Design a protein around this nucleic acid. Structure first.
Ligand SMILES: [Mg+2]
Ligand SMILES: [Mg+2]
Ligand SMILES: [Mg+2]
Ligand SMILES: [Mg+2]
Ligand SMILES: [Mg+2]
Ligand SMILES: [Mg+2]
Ligand SMILES: [Mg+2]
Ligand SMILES: [Mg+2]
Ligand SMILES: [Mg+2]
Ligand SMILES: [Mg+2]
Ligand SMILES: [Mg+2]
Ligand SMILES: [Mg+2]
Ligand SMILES: [Mg+2]
Ligand SMILES: [Mg+2]
Ligand SMILES: [Mg+2]
Ligand SMILES: [Mg+2]
Ligand SMILES: [Mg+2]
Ligand SMILES: [Mg+2]
Ligand SMILES: [Mg+2]
Ligand SMILES: [Mg+2]
Ligand SMILES: [Mg+2]
Ligand SMILES: [Mg+2]
Ligand SMILES: [Mg+2]
Ligand SMILES: [Mg+2]
Ligand SMILES: [Mg+2]
Ligand SMILES: [Mg+2]
Ligand SMILES: [Mg+2]
Ligand SMILES: [Mg+2]
Ligand SMILES: [Mg+2]
Ligand SMILES: [Mg+2]
Ligand SMILES: [Mg+2]
Ligand SMILES: [Mg+2]
Ligand SMILES: [Mg+2]
Ligand SMILES: [Mg+2]
Ligand SMILES: [Mg+2]
Ligand SMILES: [Mg+2]
Ligand SMILES: [Mg+2]
Ligand SMILES: [Mg+2]
Ligand SMILES: [Mg+2]
Ligand SMILES: [Mg+2]
Ligand SMILES: [Mg+2]
Ligand SMILES: [Mg+2]
Ligand SMILES: [Mg+2]
Ligand SMILES: [Mg+2]
Ligand SMILES: [Mg+2]
Ligand SMILES: [Mg+2]
Ligand SMILES: [Mg+2]
Ligand SMILES: [Mg+2]
Ligand SMILES: [Mg+2]
Ligand SMILES: [Mg+2]
Ligand SMILES: [Mg+2]
Ligand SMILES: [Mg+2]
Ligand SMILES: [Mg+2]
Ligand SMILES: [Mg+2]
Ligand SMILES: [Mg+2]
Ligand SMILES: [Mg+2]
Ligand SMILES: [Mg+2]
Lengths: 259, 134, 158
RNA sequence: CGACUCUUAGCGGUGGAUCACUCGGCUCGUGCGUCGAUGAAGAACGCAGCUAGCUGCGAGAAUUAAUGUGAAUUGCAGGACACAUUGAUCAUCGACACUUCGAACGCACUUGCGGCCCCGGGUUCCUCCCGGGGCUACGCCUGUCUGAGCGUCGCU
RNA sequence: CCCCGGAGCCCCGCGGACGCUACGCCGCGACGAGUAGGAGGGCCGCUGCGGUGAGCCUUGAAGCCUAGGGCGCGGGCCCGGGUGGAGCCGCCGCAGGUGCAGAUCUUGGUGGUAGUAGCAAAUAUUCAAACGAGAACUUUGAAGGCCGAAGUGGAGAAGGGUU
RNA sequence: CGAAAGACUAAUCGAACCAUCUAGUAGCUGGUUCCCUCCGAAGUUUCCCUCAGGAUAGCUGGCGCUCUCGCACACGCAGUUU
RNA sequence: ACCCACCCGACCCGUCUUGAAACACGGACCAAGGAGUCUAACACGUGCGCGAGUCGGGGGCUCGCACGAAAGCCGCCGUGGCGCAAUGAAGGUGAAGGCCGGCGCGCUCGCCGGCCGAGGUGGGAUCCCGAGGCCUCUCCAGUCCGCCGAGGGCGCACCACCGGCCCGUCUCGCCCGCCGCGCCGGGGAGGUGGAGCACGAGCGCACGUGUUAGGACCCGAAAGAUGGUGAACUAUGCCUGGGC
RNA sequence: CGCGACCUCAGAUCAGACGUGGCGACCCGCUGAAUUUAAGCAUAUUAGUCAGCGGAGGAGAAGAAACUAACCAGGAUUCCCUCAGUAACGGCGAGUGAACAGGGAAGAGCCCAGCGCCGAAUCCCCGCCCCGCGGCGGGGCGCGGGACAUGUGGCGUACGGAAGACCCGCUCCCCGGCGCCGCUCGUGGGGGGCCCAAGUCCUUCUGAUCGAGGCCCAGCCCGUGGACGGUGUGAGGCCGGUAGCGGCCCCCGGCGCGCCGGGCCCGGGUCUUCCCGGAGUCGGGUUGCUUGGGAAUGCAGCCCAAAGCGGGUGGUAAACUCCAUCUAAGGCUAAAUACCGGCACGAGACCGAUAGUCAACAAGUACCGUAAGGGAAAGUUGAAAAGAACUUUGAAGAGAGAGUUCAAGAGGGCGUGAAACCGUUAAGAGGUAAACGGGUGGGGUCCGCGCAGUCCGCCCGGAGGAUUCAACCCGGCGGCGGGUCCGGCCGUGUCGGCGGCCCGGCGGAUCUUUCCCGCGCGGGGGACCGUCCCCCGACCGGCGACCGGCCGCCGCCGGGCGCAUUUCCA
C-alpha cells in the first residue's frame, strides 16, 4: 500500500472540551470533508493499521539437499499406481507406470502427432479429464487475470527438445520438463506427491546419472547420492505375522471385562 | 499461450483498448464472415463490413434466411443497421435495430477498387501460409 | 525493560531507516541485464577472449592470504621488458599492464615473464588487412580458429 | 371487537447495506531518459451550425498541410462528396501555423506612454494625421567603431 | 489312542472382526467453580493462492427474506419455500489488511422528543373590481395610516457583477 | 503596536495563522472483534529521583525428560501424630 | 421455532475498582468501517536436511521467462560466516594420563626402552550370565521348549563426589637446553581466578512463544523546531480629503 | 601643441555569439533544527537528518596513489558480498561505528605548466571560387584585418623524457564527400503500416446460448495458434487477436566493398651527453564545526609560514635514529552504480467504490479562506431505448387503463435492495415500564401423516403358478496357490576365476620425470591403491522378482444332463 496513503491530509485534533472525540479531524473548509476523522485506522479516509510494506520477506530459501530429497520423493511416487491414481490421474488403461517411450517423440513438430501418441498410450483420458475440468474461477482472481482454471495433466520428461515442446503445447494439461532441470513445483503440484509422467528413453536413462544409484555418486550433481532409508521393510504386515516375531509375543488378552 | 512480451492479456487493458478504440481500428473489429459460397471463391474467411453489403443475420431474434442490404455502420455503437431488421416504437415509427457485425454473414460484398485490392492481399497471404505449411 | 537473561543488545534502528531501505527485487532483472550485456560484448570483440586481457599472477598481502595467489591488475614493466614486449603495444594484444607495480623478488618476476611468453606462443594475431604482412599468423591458424576463449584466459590455479 | 399500546408475520414505504460486476487505483519490473530568449513550464482570454463543463486547438482557433488508411461522422441538422476519386473518417505528424501575460525583453502595468528606420491611405517628404511592418531587456565573451586620462614613452 | 478343508465349536496355538480412517476402535477407575493469565482442540467462521472434487450453476450462482424441516454443548451448519438473475462451493495444503456492542470511536442513515418549541422589535388596515383553475398576500381604483426632508425620498463612493 | 488593560495584531493572543519535521512523546483515560476444553494467580521481596511505573524473587502455565511399579514380588517424600 | 397465559426465578451492559444495579463514567437506534502488524536482532522449544562439519549468499553458467523475475547446475561449494579451543589487559601461551622395564641415588625430582591408552567412587533404564525350581498319563533315563528366577556381572544417559590437563595469577623450590651462555629460553611442587579440556554437536532451513529497536495494539496532549501568509478587524505614526 | 605608439579604462539599438526561468525521483555544493532517546537534563542522541539556498546530468559525483601495507607483499574509481555491529568513540550511559586484506560486477587509461629545442612553425575573424550544406565543414586563393613573444602550436610529463651515434626491421593510419553491395539475433537491428488456421455441423435447452449429449473413418475440424478481449449467458474454430527463422510495403539505423578529395614519410631496441616538477601552498599554532579516529579523521577562519638526497604518509604527544612507501599545492576519462519526477510498456497469492491514489465520475473540480493554504461528495435501467403511442380524471404534479420488455415485483439517481424507522393487513394480548431465565398449559402457523402404519428382511412348512439348472461329467478360456525349485530367467550374502582390470570408468597430497607432448612446472599416458563390472561353479536367504510345464482348487463360456432337480413369481 502507498506510503502517503492516509496521511496526505493535514488534520489536527480538536482537543477535548468540544464534545466530539479527540481524533484528528480535517482542518477548516466548507466541505463535507471538514472536521471529519483523519489518519486513524478506524476513520473513513484514514490509514490502514500497519500499512503493508514491500520489504516483507517474500522469498524463502531452502537447503539444497532438501530440495533434491523432495524431487527424489516425487519421482519415487510417480511410480506407484496408487499414488498416481489417488492424485486423480486416470491411469487405468496405461500399459506400464514408469511410462517410457521411444525417442522419435523428440521428433514431432505438430500437435497432431503428440495427441495421437497420447491416445495410443491410453494417456488421453487424462487430457480428456483436463478438458472436463476447464471452468471459471471463483471470485476476485477472475478480475485479475486468473479467470479460468483446470486440471494438471501428464508430465512429459524429455532429454532434449528436437521439436517436442512445440508439439505438446496446445494440449491442455501437459507440462514438459527437461530431465537435467527438474522442478518440484511441477512434479508434486499442490505439494501433493503423485503425478502421471511420460518419459523419453534418453531422459529415463539419464535419471541415474543425475541422481546417482545407491552405490554410485550422482556423477552430474558433484557431491550427492540418494537419501538413505530409515526403515527397509515397509510392509509391517509382513513383519508382524512373521515366524520370528509372533514366536515372541504373549497371547493376546481379548475378553472385554465390562463394568 | 501468447509469448510476445509486448501484448497484454489483461482484462482491463484489453477492454479499455476496445471501448476507446479509434474509428479506423473499429473498422477491423467490426468485421464479419463471408458466406461459405464466397469463402470458396475469394479464399478469404471474413471482411470488414461496410455501408451497403448484402447480409444475413445469423443469431438472435432476427436470425433468418433473408438477405437484407446494410443500411449504416454505427462504429461508435459497435453495430450495423440492416434493411428490414427493425422494430415499431410506441408511436408506430420504425427504428433500425442494431445487430453486431460478427453475428451476421456477408452474402454479397460491395466491391470497389480498394475492397478488390484488400481481398487480393488476404487471399495471397493465406496461400503463402499453405505453401509454407506444405 | 529486560526480563531474565538475554543479550543486552543494541539494534541500530534509531535513525529514519525505512526512508533508506534498499530492496532487491531488481536482482534477477539485473542478473539478466549484465548477462545480455556480457554476451553482447563478446560478440563485439569477435575472436578476442570474452574474459578481457591476460593478467599477471600475484601473491596476496598479509600473513593471512600470503600462501594463496590471485590474478593481479596488470603485468609490470620489468616483466614486459624481459619478455620483450613494447609496453605501448602490449595493450594492443590483450596484455594487462599496470605500471605502478614494483617487483621485489625474482621468483615472482620470472613466473610472470613465463606467463607472457606462453601467451605469445598460443596467441593468434590476425593481420591488419586480409593481405598478410609480417607478425600476422598463417591462414591455417585463423580458419581453424577465429574462436573465442570462454572463461579467464590462461587461468591461475593455486 | 371498540381507540391507543406491545408482539409476531404478509405486503408497501424509507434507506442504500450486501452480493455480483470494474475503461480506476496500489505495488514490482523493463526500455528510453527529451524543457527554455528559435520565448519553457504555468496563467489568461478566446475559438463549435446548435456547446455550458471536461477535453481539443490559437484569429488558418473542436483545427491547415502532408503521409498511411479506405466510407463514414452521427444528439439533430445540414451538407458535401461521384468512396473507378489525393478520397469521407480515423491514425500518424516531417510542412505550415501558433492571440495575450509569463525567465519575459522600449518603459510601464493603467492595459497607460513612448522613441527610431521603411511601406500604404495622408502627402505628392509637408510635416502632421491614420493604418501596417521592422527594430528599441539586463548581463557577458570575441572582434569593430568612437573616444578618455598632470598613466608610460617617442617624434616634433 | 487316527486328519479340524472338518473338533463343531466357551477355545481352538491350521486362518482369522460386523471391529482395524492404529491420528482407528474398545475397556475400566477417578474427577469437572474460575477474573488476570497460560495451553489444546475446533468437519467453527471470512477473503485469495497450488492441488483436487469427469463438483454445482439460465431446467437459475451469489446475496436477500422466511410463525417451514433439522443437526450441533457451541462457534455454526444443512435442507424446504420465496426473491434474485451470473457465477459459486466441498476436501488437502499455503497465505493473510480474517470474526465487534462499547473506543464523548469513523462515515452514512433513522427515531422518540413533536405536528412540540416556534414563525411577537419598529402604531394599520378596510371596501370593490381585474386577472385568474385557485386570491388574506398580485394589480387598479377608493378609503384609512405611517416615514415626516438628520426620510422609509432623490443621487453617488467602496463592494457586488448582470443583480 | 500599546494615554499600559498583557491591551490589540482579520470571531484566534501571557506569543497570530498556514504547511512541514509529525503517526512528535505519554510510568496517564478510554477501547481492544468467534466457540468448547484443561490448568489457574497476585497485591508480598529486595533495589530504583522508587511511592498511579519498572527490576528482582515469589505465586501461574507450557514443554518435557529421568526413574518408579499391580504385570503376588516398592523406594523415597510429607503445613500430621508418636 | 410465532403469539398468549400462569407459578418460581430474575436490578444494565461495558469498564476502572478492595467494592458497581449504583446518586461512578461511556452507550438514542441501525448499517458498513475499526485496534497486537510487519522488518530487524536475540533466546528457548519444536519439525526437517546434512553432520565435524554445515551454509548460501553474492556472483556466474543454462532463455525470448507464457507459466520464470521461478526452476536447475557451479574445482566458484567455499572468499567468507557460524562451528570444530581456550585463557590472558597485553607480550603471549594453549588442553595426557597411566602403567611397566631400564638408566641417573626412584630423590614421590632428571633421562632412556616396552605396554596400555581418555581416570576413579556411589547410584543408574537396560543388556549379559545364571543355582534352582515348575510340570509332562506310570518308574527311571533324557536331549528340546518355555515360565519364573535367588545370586552375580558388563554398565548408556544423567546426577553427586574425588582425581587429572590447559590459560591467568601467587608462593616455594630444584634441575635442564644452545649458532647466538643471557636482565636468554625451558620445565617442577603446592594453592588460587577462567564464560576451559575430560572421544565432537554443530550448521542451514521452517514454525511457535517471549524480549527488545523501529509509527510498533488503536486513539489522545500542553509543547518544541523549519519555512512561509496576513495590519480588509484592531494598535500606533505619516500623507490627502470630508464632518461638527 | 600637435601628431604617433602603447597601458588602463569608457560608450555604442556596432558584427556575431552565449547566460537568465522551469523540472527536480535519482546527483553535486553549502546550510542546518527540534520533537525524540537517555525512563529527569545540559554533553551525547535524534543528525550532517527535515525545512532553507545554490547547480547538474542521463546519470551525477569519483577516478589513474603525496594509496595500501609491513606480506614470499598488493596496485585508479565506483558497486555487491564479507570484513563487522568489529577496531574505535561515548555523562565509557543511552547509544554510535568505520577501514585494509579476501571474493566478485566492471575494467581504460590519459593530458598540461614547467625544463628544452624548433624563423609563431599557432589561432580567430574577413572577402572571392569549387564541392558539401535541417548537427556551418572541406579544399583552394587574397600584402585583407586581428590575437600572440607579459608565449600560440609540434615534440614531451615522472610508467621517465630529450638529443646523439651506430644493432635491427620494414613502411597504413586517419578524416570531407560521393556511390554500391550483403537489411545486419530472438532467433530480419529500430520505427511505422497492412496481412495470414479451424463448425455458427446435428439435435436439444434458452428471451438470447456461448450451455448438454452427438458427429462411423481412430475418434467433426484446426492446433508452432486451448493467451486475452469482444460479440443478447459459460466461445481454440463468430470477430479482433494469439502461434510462426510467417509474408509484403515504407522509412531509419548500424556495419561491409568501390571511387574521389585531402591529410600522413609517422618505428624499436643498444651505448653516450643532457633534462626534470605546480607557495600565501605545505607545515606549525589556533579557535569552531566535523569524524570511529582516540595528546586534533577531515574541513575552516585568524597568526605564523617553509624546503629540495626535499616533501607527505607509516592510527599515542616528543627527540635521536635506520627502513618502507608514495610524489601533494594544475587538468580530462567510458564501464559495472542510482532513479517514489518524465515518456512508453509488461506483470501481480494487492484493493474492488466508507476499499484502492485526494480523485473509477465535467477532481485538485465544486466549496471555504484576505492570503499561505484547505479540499469533498459522487460508479451500475436494459440484450436492445424497445424510455411507456393512445384513451381518460385533474390547473398541474400526480394517477387509472393501454402498451414495450423474459421482467418495470428493471420506469431515466432506474441491478440486487439488508437493518434502523414508518404505514397498513392478519392474528394474539394488555391496571404493577418493558424485556428476560426455568417450567407447563392454550391458540396459531406450517410440516409429516393414515382414508389400517400394522413396518420390513432371512430361513422353513404347506398351497398355487412359471423358466432352465444347478449336482455331474466332457471341451474351451481365465485366475489362484503349491511344492519337485523340476527346467530356465531373476537378484542378496559368501567363496573361485584376477576373469572386466588395457576390450571398467572416476578419485587419490599413492608412485614413476626409465614414458610421451608442451613449456623445475602444466597436460597426457604408465604403474599402485580405493571404488564400480564379466565368466562359471558351489552354498545359502528361494526373497511378491519372474517365466515354463505338472499338480490341486476356484470362477466364466459352451457342450452335454429334461426334471422327486435348480430356479422365478404370487
Ligand atoms: Mg484509504
Ligand atoms: Mg463471494
Ligand atoms: Mg571479469
Ligand atoms: Mg409490520
Ligand atoms: Mg454511496
Ligand atoms: Mg473448569
Ligand atoms: Mg480469561
Ligand atoms: Mg447480467
Ligand atoms: Mg489482503
Ligand atoms: Mg456496530
Ligand atoms: Mg404553536
Ligand atoms: Mg434610484
Ligand atoms: Mg508559546
Ligand atoms: Mg499510535
Ligand atoms: Mg506512574
Ligand atoms: Mg497444569
Ligand atoms: Mg487507574
Ligand atoms: Mg475507590
Ligand atoms: Mg457493572
Ligand atoms: Mg447510591
Ligand atoms: Mg473517567
Ligand atoms: Mg451518555
Ligand atoms: Mg464489521
Ligand atoms: Mg532450535
Ligand atoms: Mg526470554
Ligand atoms: Mg510491537
Ligand atoms: Mg498525536
Ligand atoms: Mg523543549
Ligand atoms: Mg536553471
Ligand atoms: Mg528525555
Ligand atoms: Mg519518558
Ligand atoms: Mg523533560
Ligand atoms: Mg551525529
Ligand atoms: Mg532537503
Ligand atoms: Mg562525470
Ligand atoms: Mg592526483
Ligand atoms: Mg582499495
Ligand atoms: Mg560475526
Ligand atoms: Mg553519528
Ligand atoms: Mg611550452
Ligand atoms: Mg474467446
Ligand atoms: Mg465472452
Ligand atoms: Mg480467426
Ligand atoms: Mg558529532
Ligand atoms: Mg607511533
Ligand atoms: Mg573530474
Ligand atoms: Mg462511490
Ligand atoms: Mg459507494
Ligand atoms: Mg475512495
Ligand atoms: Mg456497493
Ligand atoms: Mg445502486
Ligand atoms: Mg450498488
Ligand atoms: Mg428480474
Ligand atoms: Mg430488476
Ligand atoms: Mg432498483
Ligand atoms: Mg447492475
Ligand atoms: Mg388486530
Amino acid at each position: 500500500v502507498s506510503e502517503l496513503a492516509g496521511h496526505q491530509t493535514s488534520a489536527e485534533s480538536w482537543g477535548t472540551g468540544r464534545a466530539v472525540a479527540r481524533i484528528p479531524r480535517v482542518r477548516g473548509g466548507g466541505t463535507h470533508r471538514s472536521g471529519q476523522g483523519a489518519f486513524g485506522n478506524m476513520c473513513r479516509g484514514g490509514r490502514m493499521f500497519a500499512p503493508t510494506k514491500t520489504w516483507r520477506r517474500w522469498h524463502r530459501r531452502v537447503n539444497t539437499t532438501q530440495k533434491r530429497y523432495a524431487i527424489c520423493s516425487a519421482l519415487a511416487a510417480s511410480a506407484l499406481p496408487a499414488l498416481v491414481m489417488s492424485k486423480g490421474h486416470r491411469i487405468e488403461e496405461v500399459p506400464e507406470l514408469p511410462l517410457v517411450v521411444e525417442d522419435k517423440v523428440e521428433g514431432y513438430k505438430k500437435t497432431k502427432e503428440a495427441v495421437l501418441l497420447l491416445k495410443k498410450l491410453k494417456a488421453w483420458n487424462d487430457i480428456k479429464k483436463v478438458y472436463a475440468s476447464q471452468r471459471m474461477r471463483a471470485g476476485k482472481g477472475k478480475m485479475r487475470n486468473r479467470r479460468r482454471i483446470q486440471r494438471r495433466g501428464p508430465c512429459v520428461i524429455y532429454n532434449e527438445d528436437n521439436g517436442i515442446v512445440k508439439a505438446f503445447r496446445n494440449i491442455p494439461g501437459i507440462t514438459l520438463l527437461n530431465v537435467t532441470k527438474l522442478n518440484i513445483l511441477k512434479l508434486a503440484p499442490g505439494g501433493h506427491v503423485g503425478r502421471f509422467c511420460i518419459w523419453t528413453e534418453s531422459a529415463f536413462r539419464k535419471l541415474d546419472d543425475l541422481y546417482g544409484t545407491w552405490r554410485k555418486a550422482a556423477s552430474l550433481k558433484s557431491n550427492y547420492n540418494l537419501p538413505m532409508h530409515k526403515m527397509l521393510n515397509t510392509d509391517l504386515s509382513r513383519i508382524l505375522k512373521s515366524p520370528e516375531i509372533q514366536r515372541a509375543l504373549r497371547a493376546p488378552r481379548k475378553k472385554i471385562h465390562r463394568r | 499461450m501468447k509469448f510476445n512480451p509486448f501484448v497484454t492479456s489483461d482484462r482491463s487493458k484489453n477492454r479499455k483498448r476496445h471501448f476507446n478504440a479509434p474509428s479506423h481500428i473499429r473498422r477491423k473489429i467490426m468485421s464479419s464472415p463471408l458466406s461459405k459460397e464466397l469463402r470458396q471463391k475469394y479464399n478469404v474467411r471474413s471482411m470488414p463490413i461496410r455501408k451497403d453489403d448484402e447480409v444475413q443475420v445469423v443469431r438472435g431474434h432476427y436470425k433468418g434466411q433473408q438477405i437484407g442490404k446494410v443500411v449504416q455502420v454505427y462504429r461508435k455503437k459497435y453495430v450495423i443497421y440492416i434493411e428490414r431488421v427493425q422494430r415499431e416504437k410506441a408511436n408506430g415509427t420504425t427504428v433500425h435495430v442494431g445487430i453486431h457485425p460478427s453475428k451476421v454473414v456477408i452474402t454479397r460484398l460491395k466491391l470497389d477498387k480498394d475492397r478488390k485490392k484488400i481481398l487480393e492481399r488476404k487471399a495471397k497471404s493465406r496461400q503463402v501460409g499453405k505453401e509454407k505449411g506444405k | 525493560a529486560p526480563s531474565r537473561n538475554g543479550m543486552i543488545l543494541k539494534p541500530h534502528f534509531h535513525k529514519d531507516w525505512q526512508r533508506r531501505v534498499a530492496t532487491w527485487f531488481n536482482q534477477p532483472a539485473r542478473k539478466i541485464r549484465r548477462r545480455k550485456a556480457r554476451q553482447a560484448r563478446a560478440r563485439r570483440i569477435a575472436p578476442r577472449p570474452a574474459s578481457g586481457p591476460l593478467r599477471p599472477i600475484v601473491r596476496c598481502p598479509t600473513v593471512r592470504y600470503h600462501t594463496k595467489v590471485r590474478a593481479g591488475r596488470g603485468f609490470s614493466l620489468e616483466e614486459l621488458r624481459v619478455a620483450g614486449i613494447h609496453k605501448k603495444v602490449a595493450r594492443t594484444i590483450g596484455i594487462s599492464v599496470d605500471p605502478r607495480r614494483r617487483n621485489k623478488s625474482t621468483e615472482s618476476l620470472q613466473a610472470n615473464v613465463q606467463r607472457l611468453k606462453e601467451y605469445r606462443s598460443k596467441l593468434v594475431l590476425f593481420p591488419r588487412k586480409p593481405s598478410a604482412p609480417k607478425k600476422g599468423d598463417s591462414s591455417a591458424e585463423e580458419l581453424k580458429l577465429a574462436t573465442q576463449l570462454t572463461g579467464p584466459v590462461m587461468p591461475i590455479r593455486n
